Coordinates of C-alpha atoms in Angstrom, one line a residue:
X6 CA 26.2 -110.6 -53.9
X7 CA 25.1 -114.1 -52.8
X8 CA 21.9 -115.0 -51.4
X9 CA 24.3 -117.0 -48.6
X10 CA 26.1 -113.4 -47.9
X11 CA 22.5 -111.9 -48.0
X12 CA 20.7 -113.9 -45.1
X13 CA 24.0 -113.3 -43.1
X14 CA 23.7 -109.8 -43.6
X15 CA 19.9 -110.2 -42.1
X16 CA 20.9 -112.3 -39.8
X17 CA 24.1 -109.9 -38.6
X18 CA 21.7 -106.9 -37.8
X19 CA 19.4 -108.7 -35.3
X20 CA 22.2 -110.3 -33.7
X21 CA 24.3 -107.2 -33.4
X22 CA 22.8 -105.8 -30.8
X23 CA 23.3 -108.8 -28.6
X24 CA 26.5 -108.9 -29.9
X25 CA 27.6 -105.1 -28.5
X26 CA 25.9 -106.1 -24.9
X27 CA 28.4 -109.4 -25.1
X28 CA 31.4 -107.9 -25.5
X29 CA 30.4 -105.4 -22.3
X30 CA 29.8 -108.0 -20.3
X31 CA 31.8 -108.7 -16.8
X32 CA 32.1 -111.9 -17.2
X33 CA 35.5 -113.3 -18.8
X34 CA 34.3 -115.8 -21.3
X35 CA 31.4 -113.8 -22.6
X36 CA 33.5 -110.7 -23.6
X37 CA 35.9 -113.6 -25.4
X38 CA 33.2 -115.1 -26.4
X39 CA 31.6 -111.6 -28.1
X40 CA 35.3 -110.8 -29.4
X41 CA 35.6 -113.7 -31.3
X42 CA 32.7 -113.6 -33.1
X43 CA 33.6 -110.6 -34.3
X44 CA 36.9 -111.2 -35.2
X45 CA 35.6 -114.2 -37.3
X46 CA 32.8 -112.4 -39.1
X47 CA 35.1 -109.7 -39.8
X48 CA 37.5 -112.2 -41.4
X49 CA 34.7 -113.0 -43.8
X50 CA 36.9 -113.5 -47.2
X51 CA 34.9 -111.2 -49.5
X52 CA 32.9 -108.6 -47.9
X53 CA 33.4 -108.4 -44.5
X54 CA 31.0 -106.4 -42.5
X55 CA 33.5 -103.7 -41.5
X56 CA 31.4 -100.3 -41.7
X57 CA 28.3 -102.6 -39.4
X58 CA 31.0 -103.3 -36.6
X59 CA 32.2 -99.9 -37.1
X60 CA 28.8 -98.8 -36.6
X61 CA 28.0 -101.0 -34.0
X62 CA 31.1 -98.8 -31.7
X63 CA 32.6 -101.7 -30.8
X64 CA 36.4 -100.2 -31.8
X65 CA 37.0 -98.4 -28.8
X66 CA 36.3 -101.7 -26.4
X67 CA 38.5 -103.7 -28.9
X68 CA 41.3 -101.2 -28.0
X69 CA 40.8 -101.3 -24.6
X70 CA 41.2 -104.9 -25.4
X71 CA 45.1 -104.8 -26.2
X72 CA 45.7 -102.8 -23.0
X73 CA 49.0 -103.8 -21.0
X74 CA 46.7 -105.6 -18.5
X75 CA 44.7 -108.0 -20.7
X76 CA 44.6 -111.6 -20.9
X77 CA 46.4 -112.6 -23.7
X78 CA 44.0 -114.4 -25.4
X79 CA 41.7 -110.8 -25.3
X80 CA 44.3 -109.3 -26.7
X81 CA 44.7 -111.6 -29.6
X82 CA 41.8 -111.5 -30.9
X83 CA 40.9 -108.1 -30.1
X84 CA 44.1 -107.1 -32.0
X85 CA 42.6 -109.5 -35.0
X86 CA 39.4 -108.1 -35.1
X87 CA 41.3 -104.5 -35.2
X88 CA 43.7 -105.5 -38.3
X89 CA 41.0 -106.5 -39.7
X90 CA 39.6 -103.4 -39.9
X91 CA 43.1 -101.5 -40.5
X92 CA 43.9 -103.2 -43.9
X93 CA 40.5 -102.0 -44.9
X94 CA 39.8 -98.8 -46.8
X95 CA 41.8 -95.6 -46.1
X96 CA 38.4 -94.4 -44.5
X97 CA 37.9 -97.6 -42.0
X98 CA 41.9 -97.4 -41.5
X99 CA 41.0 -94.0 -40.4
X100 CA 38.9 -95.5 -37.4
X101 CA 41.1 -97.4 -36.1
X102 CA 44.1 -94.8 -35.6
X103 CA 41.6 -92.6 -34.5
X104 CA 40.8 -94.9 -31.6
X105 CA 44.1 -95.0 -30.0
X106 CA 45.4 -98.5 -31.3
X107 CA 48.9 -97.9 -32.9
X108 CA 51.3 -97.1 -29.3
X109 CA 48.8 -100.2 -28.2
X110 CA 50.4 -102.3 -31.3
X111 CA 53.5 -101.1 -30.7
X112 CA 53.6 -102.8 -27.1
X113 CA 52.4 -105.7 -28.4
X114 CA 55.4 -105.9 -31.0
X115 CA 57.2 -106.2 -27.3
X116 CA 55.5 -108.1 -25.2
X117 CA 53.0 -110.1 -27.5
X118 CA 53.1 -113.7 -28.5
X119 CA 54.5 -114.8 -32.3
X120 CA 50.8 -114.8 -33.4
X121 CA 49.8 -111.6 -31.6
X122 CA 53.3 -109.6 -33.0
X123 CA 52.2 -110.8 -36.6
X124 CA 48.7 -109.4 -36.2
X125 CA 50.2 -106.2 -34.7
X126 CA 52.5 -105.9 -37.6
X127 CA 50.5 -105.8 -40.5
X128 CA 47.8 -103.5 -38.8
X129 CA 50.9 -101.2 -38.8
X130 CA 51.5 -101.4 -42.0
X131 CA 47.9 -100.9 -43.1
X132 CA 48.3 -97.5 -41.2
X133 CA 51.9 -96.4 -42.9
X134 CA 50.8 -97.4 -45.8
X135 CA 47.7 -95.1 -45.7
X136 CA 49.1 -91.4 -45.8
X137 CA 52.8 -90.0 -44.9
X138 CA 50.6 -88.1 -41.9
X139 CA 50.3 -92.2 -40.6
X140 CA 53.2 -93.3 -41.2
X141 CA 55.2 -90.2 -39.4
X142 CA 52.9 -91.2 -37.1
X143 CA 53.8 -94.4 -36.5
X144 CA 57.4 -93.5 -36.8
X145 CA 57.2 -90.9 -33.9
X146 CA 55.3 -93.2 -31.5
X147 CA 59.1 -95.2 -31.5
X148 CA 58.3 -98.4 -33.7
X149 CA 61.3 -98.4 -35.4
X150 CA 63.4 -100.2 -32.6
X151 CA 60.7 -103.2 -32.0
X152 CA 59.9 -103.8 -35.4
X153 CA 63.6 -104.4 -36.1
X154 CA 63.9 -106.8 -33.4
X155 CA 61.4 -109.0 -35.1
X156 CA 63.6 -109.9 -37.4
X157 CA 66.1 -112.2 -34.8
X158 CA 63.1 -114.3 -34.5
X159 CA 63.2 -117.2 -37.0
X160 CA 59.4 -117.5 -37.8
X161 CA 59.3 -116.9 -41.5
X162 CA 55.8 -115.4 -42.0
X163 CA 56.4 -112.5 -39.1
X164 CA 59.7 -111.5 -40.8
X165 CA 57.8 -111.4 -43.8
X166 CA 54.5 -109.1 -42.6
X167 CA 57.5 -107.2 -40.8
X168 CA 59.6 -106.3 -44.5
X169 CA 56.7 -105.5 -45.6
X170 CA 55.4 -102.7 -42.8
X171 CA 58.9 -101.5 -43.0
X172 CA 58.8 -100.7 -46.6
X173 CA 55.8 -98.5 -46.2
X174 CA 57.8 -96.9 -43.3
X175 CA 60.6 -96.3 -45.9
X176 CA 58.1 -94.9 -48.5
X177 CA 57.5 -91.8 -49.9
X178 CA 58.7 -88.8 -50.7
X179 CA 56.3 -85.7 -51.0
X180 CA 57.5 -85.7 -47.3
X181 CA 60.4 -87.4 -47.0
X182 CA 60.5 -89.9 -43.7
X183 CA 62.7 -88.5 -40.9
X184 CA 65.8 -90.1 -42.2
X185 CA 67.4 -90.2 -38.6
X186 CA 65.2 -92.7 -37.8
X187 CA 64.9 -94.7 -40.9
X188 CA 68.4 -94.9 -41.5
X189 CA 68.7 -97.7 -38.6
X190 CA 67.0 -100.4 -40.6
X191 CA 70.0 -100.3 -43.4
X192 CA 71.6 -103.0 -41.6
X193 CA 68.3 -105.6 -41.2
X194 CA 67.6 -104.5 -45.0
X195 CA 71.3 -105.6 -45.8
X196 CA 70.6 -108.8 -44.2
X197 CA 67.0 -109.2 -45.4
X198 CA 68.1 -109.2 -49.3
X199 CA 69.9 -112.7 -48.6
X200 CA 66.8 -114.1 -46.9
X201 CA 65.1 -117.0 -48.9
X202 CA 61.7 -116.4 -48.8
X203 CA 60.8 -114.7 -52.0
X204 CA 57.8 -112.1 -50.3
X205 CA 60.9 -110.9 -48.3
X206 CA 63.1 -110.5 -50.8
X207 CA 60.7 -108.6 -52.8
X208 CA 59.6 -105.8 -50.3
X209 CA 63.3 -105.8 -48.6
X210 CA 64.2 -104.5 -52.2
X211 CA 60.9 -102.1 -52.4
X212 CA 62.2 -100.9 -49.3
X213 CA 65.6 -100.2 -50.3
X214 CA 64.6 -98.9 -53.7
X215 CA 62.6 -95.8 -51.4
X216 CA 65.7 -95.4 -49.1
X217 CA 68.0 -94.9 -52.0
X218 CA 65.3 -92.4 -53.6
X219 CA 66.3 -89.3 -52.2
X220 CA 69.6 -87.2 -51.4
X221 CA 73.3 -88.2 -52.2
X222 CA 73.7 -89.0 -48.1
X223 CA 70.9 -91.7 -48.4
X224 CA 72.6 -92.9 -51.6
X225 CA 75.7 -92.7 -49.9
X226 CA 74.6 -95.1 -46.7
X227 CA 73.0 -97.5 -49.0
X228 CA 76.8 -98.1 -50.6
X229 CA 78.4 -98.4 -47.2
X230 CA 76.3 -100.9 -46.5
X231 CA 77.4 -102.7 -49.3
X232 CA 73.8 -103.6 -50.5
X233 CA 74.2 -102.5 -53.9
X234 CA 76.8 -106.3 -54.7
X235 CA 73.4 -107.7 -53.7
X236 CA 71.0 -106.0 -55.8
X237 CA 72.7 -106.1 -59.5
X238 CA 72.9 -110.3 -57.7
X239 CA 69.4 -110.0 -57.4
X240 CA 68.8 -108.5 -61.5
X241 CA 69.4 -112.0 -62.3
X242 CA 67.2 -113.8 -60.1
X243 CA 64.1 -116.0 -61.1
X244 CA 60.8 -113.7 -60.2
X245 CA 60.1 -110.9 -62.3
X246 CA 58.6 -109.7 -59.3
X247 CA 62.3 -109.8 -57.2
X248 CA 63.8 -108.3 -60.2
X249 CA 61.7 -105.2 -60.5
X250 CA 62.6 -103.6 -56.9
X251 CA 66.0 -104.4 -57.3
X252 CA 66.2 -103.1 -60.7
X253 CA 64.6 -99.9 -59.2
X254 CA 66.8 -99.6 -56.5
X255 CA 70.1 -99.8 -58.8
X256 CA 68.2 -97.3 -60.9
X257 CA 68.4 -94.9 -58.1
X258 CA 72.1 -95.0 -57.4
X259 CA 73.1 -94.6 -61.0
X260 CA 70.8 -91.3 -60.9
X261 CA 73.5 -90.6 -58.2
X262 CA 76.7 -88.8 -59.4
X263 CA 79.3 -90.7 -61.6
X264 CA 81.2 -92.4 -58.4
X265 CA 77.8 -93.4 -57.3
X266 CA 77.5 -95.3 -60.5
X267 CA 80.5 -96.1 -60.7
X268 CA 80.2 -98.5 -58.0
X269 CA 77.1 -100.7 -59.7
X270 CA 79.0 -100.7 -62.6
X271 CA 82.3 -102.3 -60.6
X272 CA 79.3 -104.5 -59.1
X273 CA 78.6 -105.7 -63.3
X274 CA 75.4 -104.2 -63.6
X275 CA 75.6 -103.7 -67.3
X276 CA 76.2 -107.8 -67.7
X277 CA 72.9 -107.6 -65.8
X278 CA 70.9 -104.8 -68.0
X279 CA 71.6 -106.5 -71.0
X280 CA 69.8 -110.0 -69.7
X281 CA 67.6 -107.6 -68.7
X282 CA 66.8 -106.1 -72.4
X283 CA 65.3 -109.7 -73.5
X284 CA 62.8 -109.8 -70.1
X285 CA 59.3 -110.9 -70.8
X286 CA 58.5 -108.1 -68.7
X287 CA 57.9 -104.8 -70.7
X288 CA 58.3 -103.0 -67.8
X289 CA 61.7 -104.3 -67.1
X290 CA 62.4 -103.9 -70.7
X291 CA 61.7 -100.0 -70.2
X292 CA 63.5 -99.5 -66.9
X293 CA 66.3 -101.6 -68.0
X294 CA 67.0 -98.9 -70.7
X295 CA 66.0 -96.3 -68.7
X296 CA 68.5 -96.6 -66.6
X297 CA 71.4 -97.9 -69.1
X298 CA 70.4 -94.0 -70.9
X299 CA 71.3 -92.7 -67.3
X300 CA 74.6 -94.0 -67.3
X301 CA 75.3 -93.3 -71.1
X302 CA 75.2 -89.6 -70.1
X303 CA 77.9 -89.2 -67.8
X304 CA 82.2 -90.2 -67.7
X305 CA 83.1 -91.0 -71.7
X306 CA 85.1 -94.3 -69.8
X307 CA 81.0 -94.6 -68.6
X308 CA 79.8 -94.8 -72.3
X309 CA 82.6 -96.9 -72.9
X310 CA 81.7 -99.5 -70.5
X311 CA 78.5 -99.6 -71.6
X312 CA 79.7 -100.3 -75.3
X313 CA 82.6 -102.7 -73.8
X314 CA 79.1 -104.5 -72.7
X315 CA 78.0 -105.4 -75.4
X316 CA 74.5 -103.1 -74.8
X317 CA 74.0 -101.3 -78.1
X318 CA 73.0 -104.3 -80.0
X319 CA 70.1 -105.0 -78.0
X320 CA 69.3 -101.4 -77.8
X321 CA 69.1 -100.9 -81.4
X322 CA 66.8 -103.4 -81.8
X323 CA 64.7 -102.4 -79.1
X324 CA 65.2 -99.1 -80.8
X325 CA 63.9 -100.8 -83.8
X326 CA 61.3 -103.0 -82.9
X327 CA 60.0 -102.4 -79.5
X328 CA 56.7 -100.4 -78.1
X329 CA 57.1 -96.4 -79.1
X330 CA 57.4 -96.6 -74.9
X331 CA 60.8 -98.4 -74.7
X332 CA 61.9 -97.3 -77.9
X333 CA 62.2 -93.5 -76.2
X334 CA 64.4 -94.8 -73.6
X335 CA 66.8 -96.9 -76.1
X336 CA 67.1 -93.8 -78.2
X337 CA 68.4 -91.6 -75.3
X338 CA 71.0 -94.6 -74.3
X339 CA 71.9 -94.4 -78.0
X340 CA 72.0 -90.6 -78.7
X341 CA 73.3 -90.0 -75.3
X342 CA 76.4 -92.6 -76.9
X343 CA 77.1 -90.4 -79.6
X344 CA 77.3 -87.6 -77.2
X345 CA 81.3 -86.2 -77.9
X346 CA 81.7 -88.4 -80.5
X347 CA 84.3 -85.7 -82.2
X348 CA 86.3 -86.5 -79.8
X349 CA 85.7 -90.6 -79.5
X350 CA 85.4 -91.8 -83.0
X351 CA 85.5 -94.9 -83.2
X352 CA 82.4 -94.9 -81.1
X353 CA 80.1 -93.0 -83.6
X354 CA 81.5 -95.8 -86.6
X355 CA 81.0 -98.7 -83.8
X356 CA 77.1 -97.8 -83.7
X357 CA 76.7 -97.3 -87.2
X358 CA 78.3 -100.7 -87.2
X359 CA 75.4 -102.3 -85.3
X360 CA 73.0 -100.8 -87.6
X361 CA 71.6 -97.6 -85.7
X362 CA 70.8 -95.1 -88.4
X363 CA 68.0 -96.8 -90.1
X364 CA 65.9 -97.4 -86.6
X365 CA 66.9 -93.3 -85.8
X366 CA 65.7 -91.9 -89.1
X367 CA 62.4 -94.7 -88.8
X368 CA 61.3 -93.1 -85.4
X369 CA 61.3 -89.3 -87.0
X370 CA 57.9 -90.0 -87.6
X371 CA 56.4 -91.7 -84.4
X372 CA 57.9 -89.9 -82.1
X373 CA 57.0 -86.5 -79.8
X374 CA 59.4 -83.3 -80.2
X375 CA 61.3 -84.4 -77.4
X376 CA 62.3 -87.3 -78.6
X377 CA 62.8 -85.7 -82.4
X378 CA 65.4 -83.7 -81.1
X379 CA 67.2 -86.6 -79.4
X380 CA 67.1 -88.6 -82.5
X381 CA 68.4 -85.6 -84.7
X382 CA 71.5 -85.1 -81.8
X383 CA 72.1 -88.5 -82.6
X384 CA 71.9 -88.5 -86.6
X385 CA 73.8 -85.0 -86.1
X386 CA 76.6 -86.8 -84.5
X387 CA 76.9 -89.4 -87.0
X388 CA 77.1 -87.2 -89.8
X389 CA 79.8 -85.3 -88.6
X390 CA 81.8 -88.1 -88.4
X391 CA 80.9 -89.1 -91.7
X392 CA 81.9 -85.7 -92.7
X393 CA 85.1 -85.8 -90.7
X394 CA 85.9 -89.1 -91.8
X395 CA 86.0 -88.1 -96.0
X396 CA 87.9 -84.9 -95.0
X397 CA 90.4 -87.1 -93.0
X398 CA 91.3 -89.1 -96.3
X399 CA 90.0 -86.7 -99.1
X400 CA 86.7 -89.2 -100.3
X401 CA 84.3 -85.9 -101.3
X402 CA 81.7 -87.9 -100.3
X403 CA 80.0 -88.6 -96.6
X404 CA 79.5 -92.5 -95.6
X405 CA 77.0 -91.5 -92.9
X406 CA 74.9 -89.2 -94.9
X407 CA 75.0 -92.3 -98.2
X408 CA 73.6 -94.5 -95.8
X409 CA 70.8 -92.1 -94.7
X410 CA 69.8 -91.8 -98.3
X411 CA 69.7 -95.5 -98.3
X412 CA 67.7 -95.9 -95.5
X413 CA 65.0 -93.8 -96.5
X414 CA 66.2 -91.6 -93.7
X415 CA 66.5 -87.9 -96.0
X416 CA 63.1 -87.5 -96.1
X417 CA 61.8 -88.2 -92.8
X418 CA 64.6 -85.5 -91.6
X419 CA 63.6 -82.8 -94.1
X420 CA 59.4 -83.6 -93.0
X421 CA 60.5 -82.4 -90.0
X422 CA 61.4 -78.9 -91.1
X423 CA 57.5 -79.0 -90.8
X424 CA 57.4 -78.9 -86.9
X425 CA 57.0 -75.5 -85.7
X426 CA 59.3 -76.4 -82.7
X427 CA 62.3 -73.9 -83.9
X428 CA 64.5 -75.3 -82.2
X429 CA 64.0 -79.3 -84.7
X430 CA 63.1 -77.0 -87.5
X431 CA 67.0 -75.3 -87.3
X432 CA 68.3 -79.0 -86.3
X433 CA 66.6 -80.3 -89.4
X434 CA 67.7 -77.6 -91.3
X435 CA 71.0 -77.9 -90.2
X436 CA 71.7 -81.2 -91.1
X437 CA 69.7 -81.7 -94.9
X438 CA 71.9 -77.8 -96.1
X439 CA 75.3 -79.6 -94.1
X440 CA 75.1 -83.2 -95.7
X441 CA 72.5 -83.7 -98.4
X442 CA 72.4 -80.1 -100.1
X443 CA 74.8 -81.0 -103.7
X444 CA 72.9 -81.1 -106.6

């Protein structure tokens, strides 16, 4: 809080006054004049004096600014000094919308220059982004049809500001955006996931990721379009910051119902998870198992695949080594594996291969009561097939429970006949009197 921004500050508040008489002027070149001094002060990098200007009352003139009939260069930096003020605080955003500007933006996206549609743009955005009142808002004042057009202009930056305001038209959920109208930009989306400017790429998949966050007919339209080939592409691109949308967006169609996921997986999304499993990204890391857990309940040929790709490896040692938060995630994928298991054997034996039971039995003790039971499914499961197994050729003893014992895995199982959860306290129970109760 400089002593530069402080005589600025001193010198704004005398000057303000002739500032708001300047911009009411008749002449032409004096109302410029006024308008671009405020657009520049209110472009100040840190701090800009947006409550002063908005104290001064100067909004409403500004709007008036953009009207149909202005000259253009009014209108410019009028529609400046307003975005400006949009992608403020929610409050000062408040101001602006409550002024009249958005179907004056909206024109502008028409019949505005390049410059002007870009500033138009992202004070749009600044307003959807604000509440889901705003953003209905915006959508019911028709901007969905000229903010698509934007995009068969070739100038990079407006595409850009233009992804991005259309995301926040896509977002959110607590109301859901009036799908009939939200729907048209599937086709520019499909199209804007190819584009090669990164910031594009990035909110074109934020954008998708909300579209394909609600009902099986949005999921649905999102297939048709054949984005989803592009995303799981997009899993194994450069940015972190391109990967985490698109990883989102995937995440939402396998949440879908099994022919939902079923396409991502014909698209090799598990090639693309398991890359994923090693990202520097924790984040990533998380999701990427989160969602590979969302596929491993579902068609046995699912949990198949998912073995076929080589994922429990990684898991397990994510599983074994990774931040409690990941390692919650990994132990559903796994547990969720061993699911059936009666029926699939060679499954069960297959994990136990990779080394699961020791990490299971480790994260007894870590881990909340959700995540206990889940673990105790899971070491359930694998000592039934131990048990079936010995039966099967006569051994009298169980392979799965010896290797427990081995692992130090016994007692962590009988500590959690402890818990007063009844429901891990039977589970428990169950498995110490089934497999380790001979003398």
């Amino acid at each position: 809080s400089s002593a530069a921004d402080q005589q600025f500050y001193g010198q704004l508040q005398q000057e303000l006054p002739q500032m708001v008489q300047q911009i009411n002027s008749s002449d032409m070149q004096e109302q410029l004049a006024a308008t671009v001094k405020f657009r520049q002060i209110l472009s100040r990098e840190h701090n800009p004096p947006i409550d002063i200007v908005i104290q001064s009352g100067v909004v409403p003139t500004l709007v008036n600014f953009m009207n149909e009939n202005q000259p253009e260069m009014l209108q410019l930096e009028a529609a400046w000094a307003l975005t400006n003020i949009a992608s403020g605080t929610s409050a000062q955003t408040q101001v602006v919308v409550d002024a009249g500007a958005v179907p004056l933006f909206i024109q502008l996206l028409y019949t505005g220059s390049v410059e002007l549609q870009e500033q138009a743009i992202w004070a749009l955005g600044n307003v959807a982004g604000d509440s889901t009142s705003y953003r209905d808002y915006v959508l019911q004042c028709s901007a969905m049809e000229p903010i698509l057009s934007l995009f068969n202009s070739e100038k990079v930056t407006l595409i850009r500001t233009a992804t991005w305001t259309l995301s926040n038209l896509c977002r959110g959920k607590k109301p859901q955006p009036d799908w009939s109208i939200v729907s048209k930009a599937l086709p520019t989306l499909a199209k804007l996931i190819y584009s090669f400017d990164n910031e594009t790429l990035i909110d074109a998949c934020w954008a998708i990721s909300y579209l394909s966050d609600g009902p099986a007919e949005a999921i649905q339209a999102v297939i048709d379009a054949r984005i989803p080939k592009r995303l799981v592409e997009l899993l194994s691109h450069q940015s972190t910051l391109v990967q985490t949308p698109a990883l989102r967006a995937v995440g939402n169609i396998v949440t879908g119902n099994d022919l939902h996921t079923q396409v991502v997986i014909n698209c090799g999304v598990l090639s693309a998870l398991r890359n994923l499993l090693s990202s520097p990204k924790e984040s990533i890391r998380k999701e990427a198992c989160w969602t590979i857990s969302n596929i491993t309940a579902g068609n046995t040929e699912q949990i198949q695949a998912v073995v076929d790709a080589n994922l429990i490896p990684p898991l397990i040692k994510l599983l074994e080594t990774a931040e409690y938060k990941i390692k919650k995630e990994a132990c559903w994928a796994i547990s969720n594996a061993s699911s059936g298991g009666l029926q699939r054997p060679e499954i069960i034996r297959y994990m136990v291969s990779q080394g699961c039971i020791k990490p299971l039995c480790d994260l007894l003790e870590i881990a909340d009561n959700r995540i206990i039971e889940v673990t105790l499914d899971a070491l359930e499961n694998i000592l039934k097939m131990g048990e079936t197994d010995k039966e099967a050729r006569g051994l009298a003893i169980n392979e799965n429970a010896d290797l427990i014992e081995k692992a130090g895995g016994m007692e962590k199982i009988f500590n959690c006949q402890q818990n007063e959860n009844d429901r891990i306290y039977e589970k428990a129970y169950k498995i110490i009197e089934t497999y380790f109760g001979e003398e």
